[PDB]
Amino acid sequence: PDWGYDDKNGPEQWSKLYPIANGNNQSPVDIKTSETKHDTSLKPISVSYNPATAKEIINVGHSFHVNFEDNDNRSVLKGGPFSDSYRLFQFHFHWGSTNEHGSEHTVDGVKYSAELHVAHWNSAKYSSLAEAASKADGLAVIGVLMKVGEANPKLQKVLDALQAIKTKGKRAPFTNFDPSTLLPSSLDFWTYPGSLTHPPLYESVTWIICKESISVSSEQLAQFRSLLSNVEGDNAVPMQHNNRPTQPLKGRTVRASF
Numbered sequence: 479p480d481w482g483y484d485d486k487n488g489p490e491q492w493s494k495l496y497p498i499a500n501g502n503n504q505s506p507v508d509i510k511t512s513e514t515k516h517d518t519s520l521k522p523i524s525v526s527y528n529p530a531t532a533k534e535i536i537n538v539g540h541s542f543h544v545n546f547e548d549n550d551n552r553s554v555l556k557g558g559p560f561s562d563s564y565r566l567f568q569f570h571f572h573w574g575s576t577n578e579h580g581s582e583h584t585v586d587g588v589k590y591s592a593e594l595h596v597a598h599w600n601s602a603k604y605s606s607l608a609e610a611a612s613k614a615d616g617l618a619v620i621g622v623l624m625k626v627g628e629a630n631p632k633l634q635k636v637l638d639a640l641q642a643i644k645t646k647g648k649r650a651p652f653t654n655f656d657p658s659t660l661l662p663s664s665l666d667f668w669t670y671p672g673s674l675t676h677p678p679l680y681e682s683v684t685w686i687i688c689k690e691s692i693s694v695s696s697e698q699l700a701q702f703r704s705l706l707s708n709v710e711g712d713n714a715v716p717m718q719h720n721n722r723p724t725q726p727l728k729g730r731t732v733r734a735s736f
């Protein structure tokens with residue numbers, strides 16, 4: 479695994495292997511609210527997820543992923559800036575080494591403690607995730623800023639599952655879960671054209687960033703950081719952080735739905 483988040487293989491070094499790191503549509507960004515453009519043409523975000531599409535949780539070494547069956551349109555995102563239906567395939571989190579930072583997106587310079595990514599691919603235009611992932615209109619990702627405070631009970635199934643995937647490569651079934659339960663009450667959002675926030679950093683993402691945060695406790699964040707990046711039997715290496723710094727807007731417009 480050439481890339482990671484440590485001093486030698488981390489975000490400031492990704493450009494050596496992935497020159498798109500220094501591109502014009504890189505994510506995440508700082509959303510400066512004085513510079514957002516309210517767009518009257520934005521429709522409300524519509525999510526409709528079937529809990530039976532939940533499939534598997536996986537320790538991928540730098541993070542963990544919760545994957546969904548994506549063979550049909552049982553679980554879809556519509557509305558907002560999109561004409562096309564986008565098919566749910568994954569959610570995951572980013573976090574930092576301490577409570578002070580850990581989100582990827584920031585709002586008016588303010589860093590949150592963690593961030594939820596709910597990822598979808600354009601099944602109107604493309605035939606698979608692998609095809610869509612490199613296309614400018616291929617991916618739609620909802621970002622939710624997670625503010626340290628009260629324990630969030632909606633995270634329970636996810637946190638309880640981590641003990642079965644402690645080390646790199648471990649995976650387990652993760653079923654009967656609707657991740658719309660993790661979204662805030664308001665789906666008021668910012669949107670901008672951007673990228674995956676880690677390699678391969680493709681500029682394929684329409685970002686949908688929620689205005690409203692969701693909560694997370696200090697102890698729930700500790701559960702994320704207690705996951706191990708090493709394989710079973712090796713020296714324990716906690717997953718301390720996996721958030722990328724904010725990237726230059728390079729003249730992009732962040733639009734507001736509100």
Ligand SMILES: Nc1cc(C(Cl)=C(Cl)Cl)c(S(N)(=O)=O)cc1S(N)(=O)=O
Pocket residue numbers: 568595597598611619673674675676677678683
């Ligand atoms: N950084 C990143 C990478 C991927 C991956 Cl691992 C692929 Cl192999 Cl496409 C994906 S995804 N949704 O897994 O295709 C999303 C992101 S993110 N953090 O939401 O921008």
Ligand SMILES: [Zn+2]
Pocket residue numbers: 570571572595675
């Ligand atoms: Zn992410």
